[PDB]
């Protein structure tokens, strides 16, 4: 996260760290959506241009964390994966369209002050909140510039689709949305390397619950002027999510 700030304790109790078992390291972000299911970017698990193809056994899920590097005894919980599901139309060759994956945990995780699932949007929540200028929040342990001690937070405004499309030569799809400040707006911030798979969340003003509207997917560089962060549109892929869970 570039140009964010340190999270408060318990501010993002759905934040999940995808952890590599050997060499022990951060792979990606992710989010908790129930006591047994974790949501992330498909590119976190499968990205052939970089010879990435992780299997269940290569990885661990670390839930309830704050510190990037420390073992947070009596607070985090470390879970093994039972199974990985990648969208069958995930487009790694072109533009990362449908950049989404689910992870089923071996055992349900215990909820706590620091561990709690986020909501997934229904159609009406999506329509209400996914509007240009409306701000969301993205969190991660990724790079601070194109390594944090603790989880970082940044609030960013949703950008108009033509502004998103005109910022890149990549083909943008209805399964993506972009966010970030324009150079003229003065403020800045973005996701970066290692923040992949983490959540873009919004707080509904109607029922006061947090919803995960996006997944950290791609950006040309990090926090570059005139470029934006691109996020997987979670509601657009909700049919696939539910079918998998069901």
């Amino acid at each position: 996260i570039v140009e964010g700030s340190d999270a408060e304790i318990g501010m993002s109790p759905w934040q999940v760290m995808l952890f590599r078992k050997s060499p022990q390291e951060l792979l990606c972000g992710a989010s908790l959506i129930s006591d047994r299911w974790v949501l992330t970017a498909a590119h976190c698990l499968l990205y052939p241009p970089w010879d990435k193809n992780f299997t269940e056994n290569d990885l661990l899920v670390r839930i309830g964390k704050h510190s990037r590097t420390r073992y947070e005894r009596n607070i985090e919980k470390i879970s093994m994966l039972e199974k990985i599901y990648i969208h069958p139309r995930y487009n790694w060759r072109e533009n990362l369209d449908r950049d989404i994956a689910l992870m089923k945990l071996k055992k349900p995780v215990a909820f706590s002050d620091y561990i709690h699932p986020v909501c997934l949007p229904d159609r009406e929540t999506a329509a209400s909140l996914l509007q240009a200028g409306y701000k969301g929040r993205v969190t991660g342990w990724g790079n601070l510039k194109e390594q944090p001690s603790v989880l970082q937070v940044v609030n960013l405004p949703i950008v108009e689709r033509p502004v998103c499309k005109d910022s890149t030569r990549i083909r943008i799809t209805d399964n993506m949305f972009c966010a970030g400040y324009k150079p003229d707006e003065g403020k800045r911030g973005d996701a970066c390397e290692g923040d992949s798979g983490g959540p873009f969340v919004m707080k509904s003003p109607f029922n006061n619950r947090w919803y995960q509207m996006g997944i950290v997917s791609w950006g040309e560089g990090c926090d570059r002027d005139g470029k934006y962060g691109f996020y997987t549109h979670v509601f657009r892929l909700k049919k696939w999510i539910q079918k998998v869970i069901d």
């Binding site: 909501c119 707080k203 619950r209």
Partner: peptide, 27 residues
């Protein structure tokens, strides 16, 4: 359905330091 209600914030009626930036953009 207790999703999206954080124990240390919504559950206790406490606000985090920048959630109101988001509310103020929902215009």
């Amino acid at each position: 359905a207790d999703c999206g209600l954080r124990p240390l914030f919504e559950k206790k009626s406490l606000e985090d330091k920048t959630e109101r930036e988001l509310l103020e953009s929902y215009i």
